[PDB]
């Protein structure tokens with residue numbers, strides 16, 4: 001049997017682009033670890049990906065992961081994009097590198113480590129761990145300490 005862990009994630013950004021942060025909580029046997037970091041110029045979507053990446057990368061063995069997020073962007077990538085991207089070579093219909101390919105590839109490498117059970121939470125407000133993840137993300141967004149060197153500046 002695989003160990004079962006619960007991961008809660010959320011991302012936050014003060015503009016588009018603007019300073020932003022991620023927040024994630026990894027829970028195993030009731031004990032929790034938090035993750036968060038803030039970036040001087042990024043996007044909400046990239047922070048939503050980073051929260052999932054960082055919590056999954058913390059796992060040092062194959063697990064079953066109940067992964068709870070309210071990110072509609074992450075869902076659409078998982079459902080519409082990730083399969084055909086591994087078939088098209090991570091390119092668009094016009095043979096061009098897809099947006100945020102650096103993080104989508106990092107996520108795919110962490111996701112393939114585990115048995116993923118997605119919990120598409122409608123909204124972080126309410127589910128306590130998801131609420132705390134929003135607080136951690138906003139906290140990092142107001143104290144950014146890193147550059148998001150993977151963000152291709154669109155403005």
Ligand SMILES: [Zn+2]
Pocket residue numbers: 010011070123124125134
């Ligand atoms: Zn949220």
